[PDB]
Amino acid sequence: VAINGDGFFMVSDDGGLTNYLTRSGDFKLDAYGNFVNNAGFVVQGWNINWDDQTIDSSRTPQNIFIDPGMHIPAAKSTEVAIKANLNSGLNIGTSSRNLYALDSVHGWNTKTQRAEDENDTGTTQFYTTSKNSVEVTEKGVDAGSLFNAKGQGLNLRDGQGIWVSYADATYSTNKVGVNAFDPNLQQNQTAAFWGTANQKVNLDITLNGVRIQNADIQSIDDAIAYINTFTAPTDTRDGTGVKAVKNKDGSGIDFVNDNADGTTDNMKNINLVVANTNTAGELWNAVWNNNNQTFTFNNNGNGQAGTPTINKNGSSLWTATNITFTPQPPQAATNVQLTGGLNAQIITAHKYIYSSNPVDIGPMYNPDGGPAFQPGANATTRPTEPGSAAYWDAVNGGLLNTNVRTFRTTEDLRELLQRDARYGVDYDGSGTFAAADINQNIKVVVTADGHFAISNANEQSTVPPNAINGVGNATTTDPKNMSFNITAYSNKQGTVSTNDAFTAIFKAFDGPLVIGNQIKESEQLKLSAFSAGLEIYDSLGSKHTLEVQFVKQSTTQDGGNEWQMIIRVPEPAEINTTGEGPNNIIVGTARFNNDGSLASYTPRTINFSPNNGAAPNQQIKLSFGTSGSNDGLVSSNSASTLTGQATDGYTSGNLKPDAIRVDDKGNILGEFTNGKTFAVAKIAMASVANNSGLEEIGGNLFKVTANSGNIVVGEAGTGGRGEMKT
């Protein structure tokens, strides 16, 4: 019942030629395929050409013919398109995936036993799980693109970072073991003197940049107590983070920094410098008067038994490494001389600072695997092989410093944490690096569940020959317990902001990790991810689903972002038969501009081989948008979501007769069993110059005259016409 108030006169015909006109629209399909009216007149229009599925309205109008039992063969996909958003912002909810797992060996896949760069975006490695799952592994990710378990962006910025303490910083003064002065020992003494009730000593030291001075020290407990006023900061004065306690005989001090307090350099580790004008706890000559029962004190001496000359020799009793009495103990000493310096720096904590710029932490020999250690010509010569040279540097003290550790990716940070736990901590508080400080079985990895994980297996290790300077044979090194303290990084000027979200990730490391089977893990790390299943059809019209996943790898502040695009097909189908990597998996990229528009994506086409009977090498075009536009893939600050997908392929199908209808454009719409809807025919609409000059012949039929003018045939919706209802 196709009617038209607007626009005039359908054409109608019986046999060839001889057309007629009617505004009556009571139309149906017969059992023989002809579109007719009740009078059996076949409506005139244009038929679809199935060879190109086009309707040519330019051709001469003829009988509209629609085979009722018409079968349309399946058509294979030549193109698939997607409309979707990839969240570029800081809230991704559950549209995420875990951080990729990482080896304990930098630049090396331990399972394949090959050299692979974890930070290279050109390299992508898969592994097969126990549940027969093919996952990406061994991939370092820009730390700027990290999320927590909640889907909240850590929003890490260049210059931000954290402190990681691996153990407590400790130092004991007076390691030379000179006894403390004893007022109850009624004889001359040359000892460590901390003052009496009647004699004061001068405390003069610099501790973590803070000068600690007191000339009113009358006991070691006074010194300890005064020093500990500097442990915590005041609103006007820095703290040291260093607590002091007197040793067993009260001859010296035991310092400890757990590095759990503060966010600045001055609150971490122990850097002690003693002034040469310090007298507190130094060497004094105590002379006894038997008559008066009193003591007198001097710290200079005269070069005579009981009052020997005291030569500090540019050192302090606190920090000296050697002490020498002259003459030898069989005779009373007339001179005592110290050897060493005035400072001691104990390092157990390091700062890890993020850089959005490229970072190469470099290769280093690792017993865990990879390249072998390659020594130089001798045990006193640095290696030329890069990883070996860096290993040489490490085991000779090259990491025991306060240098900034710069990282960009998760692999960078992982390996840096591992290297510092192994060679960057003064475990015995000596102020120097030795093989005793080597904790080489510490391993830092990232699990498949996205956690940083640290192990401390109770196993000895080996340092190869010619690695430690002057040591030409192998060295067995022992494991050490570790105690973690994690804080945010800042400066005293307050010009670097702290990142609580990022710091909280690694504060999960906090606590002791004793040698054994225990494992310290970080909080879970996530990535912005979005997956979609794109439907296609093979030559036989079977439906296949392209598994497409986008994971954001990096972002720039006003330069857009970049995603890894992974396409999977279930076996035995193939999309990567001739390329490297698995044959059912394609690895590509999708890059976006700062406005969220598509910049580029690759690949643009795939070569599909279903291997189910259908034809192979089915080239399928990927239509994910054009560069610079928002028509396909976009990455903007809103939830990752699929708007729609489409393909030009379809399975085989048949025409359902009773589902026929007509649009306002005169198109006869045929619905099929395959879900497709085609315009199988377009109804011709024709008008005349005059409408008042026409004759009623049949039932609402009109024939042309000389008064009407000849018939001009056109298409509804063009000119000033159109059709209605169904």
* Phi (first) and psi of residue 161, to 5 degrees: 180, -165
CB 543, CB 651: distance < 8 Å: yes
- What is the rounded (10 degree) CA torsion for 54, 58, 64, 67? -20
Which helix (H) or strand (E) element contains residue 317? none
Q: Distance between CA atoms of 587 and 564, rounded to whole angstroms? A: 7
Q: Distance between CA atoms of 304 and 289, rounded to whole angstroms? A: 17
Q: Distance between CA atoms of 332 and 473, rounded to whole angstroms? A: 44
* Phi (first) and psi of residue 497, to 5 degrees: -80, 150
In sequence order, which ranges of 116-268 are alpha helices (DSSP H)? 220-227
Per domain, the residue ranges of the chain are 1-72+651-726, 73-100+124-147+526-650, 101-118+148-167+348-525, 168-347
CB atoms within 10 A of CB 364: 26
How does DSSP assign 330-364, residue by residue? TS--SEEEEES-SEEEE--EEEEEE-SS-------
Query: What is residue 544's three-state secondary structure?
Result: strand
What tokens appear for 400 in the block? Answer: 């025991």
* Phi (first) and psi of residue 657, to 5 degrees: -60, -45
What tokens appear for 158 in the block? Answer: 């260049």
Query: What is residue 226's three-state secondary structure?
Result: helix
Query: What is residue 599's three-state secondary structure?
Result: strand
Experimental method: X-ray
Q: Distance between CA atoms of 282 and 454, rounded to whole angstroms? A: 43
Token pair 């009793």 in the structure block, residue: 317
Q: Distance between CA atoms of 115 and 371, rounded to whole angstroms? A: 9
CB 690, CB 709: distance < 8 Å: yes
Of 335, 319, 346, 321, nearest in space to 241 by CA: 346
Of 617, 573, 609, 648, nearest in space to 75 by CA: 648
Token pair 């890069």 in the structure block, residue: 386
Resolution of the PDB structure in angstroms? 2.5
Peptide bond into 386 cis (omega under 30): no
Of 480, 548, 487, 538, nearest in space to 514 by CA: 480
**Cβ-defined contacts of 47-55 (< 8 Å, 24+):** 47/680, 47/681, 48/678, 48/679, 48/680, 48/681, 53/678, 55/667, 55/679, 55/681, 55/682
Any residues with CB less than 8 A from the CB of 577 and at least 6 apart, and which? 583, 607, 609
How does DSSP assign 60-87, residue by residue? PPEE-B--TT-EE--B--SEEEEEEE--
* Phi (first) and psi of residue 395, to 5 degrees: -80, 0
Q: Distance between CA atoms of 510 and 260, rounded to whole angstroms? A: 9
CB 523, CB 149: distance < 8 Å: yes
Q: What's the burial of 247, exposed, middle or buried (CB within 10 Å: 0-12/13-18/19+)?
A: middle
Q: Distance between CA atoms of 545 and 77, rounded to whole angstroms? A: 12
Q: Distance between CA atoms of 681 and 660, rounded to whole angstroms? A: 11
CB 74, CB 651: distance < 8 Å: yes
Q: Distance between CA atoms of 575 and 586, rounded to whole angstroms? A: 7
CB 154, CB 499: distance < 8 Å: yes
In sequence order, which ranges of 174-320 are alpha helices (DSSP H)? 220-227
Of 178, 340, 221, 192, nearest in space to 274 by CA: 340
The rounded radius of gyration (Å) of the Cα atoms in the chain is 43
What amino acid occupies position 298? N
CB 86, CB 563: distance < 8 Å: yes
Peptide bond into 327 cis (omega under 30): yes
What tokens appear for 174 in the block? Answer: 């007076």
Q: Distance between CA atoms of 509 and 166, rounded to whole angstroms? A: 10
What tokens appear for 630 in the block? Answer: 């928002």
Q: What share of residues in the chain are helix, strand, coil (percent, to 5)?
A: 10, 40, 55
Q: Distance between CA atoms of 287 and 283, rounded to whole angstroms? A: 13
Q: What is the 3-state secondary structure (H, E, C) of 636-700?
A: CCCCCEEEEEEECCECCEEECHHHCEECCCCEEEEEECCCCEEEEEEECEEEECCCCCCEECCCC
Strand partners, 547: 533, 568
Of 190, 185, 172, 171, nearest in space to 323 by CA: 190
Q: Distance between CA atoms of 703 and 354, rounded to whole angstroms? A: 86
Query: What is residue 387's three-state secondary structure?
Result: helix
